[PDB]
Amino acid sequence: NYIERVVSINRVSKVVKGGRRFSFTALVIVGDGKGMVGVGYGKAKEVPAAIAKGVEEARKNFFRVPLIGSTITHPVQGEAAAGVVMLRPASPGTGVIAGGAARAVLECAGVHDILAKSLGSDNAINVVHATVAALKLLQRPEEVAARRGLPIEDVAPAGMLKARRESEALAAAAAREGSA
RNA sequence: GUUUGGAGAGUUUGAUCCUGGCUCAGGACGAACGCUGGCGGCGUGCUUAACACAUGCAAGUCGAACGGAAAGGCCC
Ligand SMILES: [Mg+2]
Ligand SMILES: [Mg+2]
């Protein structure tokens, strides 16, 4: 099951000697809610065809979000095309505290608890791009440990190790219930 | 050491991105005004003229400091 959010529909227009030739653009976000998300921008003469092209471009651009539990690993600031988004991890229960465009990215990413603030341009297209830039700056503790050559207990905070442990237990629980 | 904690929307253009102001959704009050109005608990009430003030109260008490004797009391 893929969750699909249409963030914005924009009616654009070319000009010609005969008048204005209108077109539609759709910014579409597709994800599985398991830490995969893709962003697709589709444009066509009609709204449904624009959305459909957006869905396809999003699936072409699936990428993986490092998620410790139901939260991002560490605070990050992504900047793209004047868009600036700050992401901060939150404790369980906080919920998605995010603005409209960033909410669509993070919900489809399956982030359940996050604090997100937009600090630059309010243009939905560029806010989405900035949010993706931030999510690409997220690092896994496993990857930090390897890149540093140190063990995991040496590079990460004990409380993040703990939250890792419990999240692995719930993954095992779902595997037990699902294979039973 | 460390989680207990940040949401945005509209509006410059034929269309676009940016910059940038304006406006709105929240909360608060020693409040006022309009419509409406059942009860109780607990608070609270001149923000203006340190303007002017009828009337009654808001500082007395001690006979174990003292001479005394108007009111009571008791004794002729
Ligand atoms: Mg701005
Ligand atoms: Mg006064």
UniProtKB/Swiss-Prot annotation:
Biological processes, Gene Ontology terms: translation
Protein's UniProt keywords contain RNA-binding: yes
Alphabetized GO MF terms: rRNA binding; structural constituent of ribosome
Residue stretches making up the S5 DRBM domain: 2-65
UniProtKB keywords: Ribonucleoprotein, Ribosomal protein, RNA-binding, rRNA-binding
Signal peptide: none
Record-level GO cellular component terms: small ribosomal subunit
Family: Belongs to the universal ribosomal protein uS5 family.
Cited function: With S4 and S12 plays an important role in translational accuracy. Located at the back of the 30S subunit body where it stabilizes the conformation of the head with respect to the body.
Domain notes: The N-terminal domain interacts with the head of the 30S subunit; the C-terminal domain interacts with the body and contacts protein S4. The interaction surface between S4 and S5 is involved in control of translational fidelity.
Quaternary structure note: Part of the 30S ribosomal subunit. Contacts proteins S4 and S8.
Protein name as annotated: Small ribosomal subunit protein uS5
Source taxonomy: Bacteria, Bacillati, Actinomycetota, Actinomycetes, Mycobacteriales
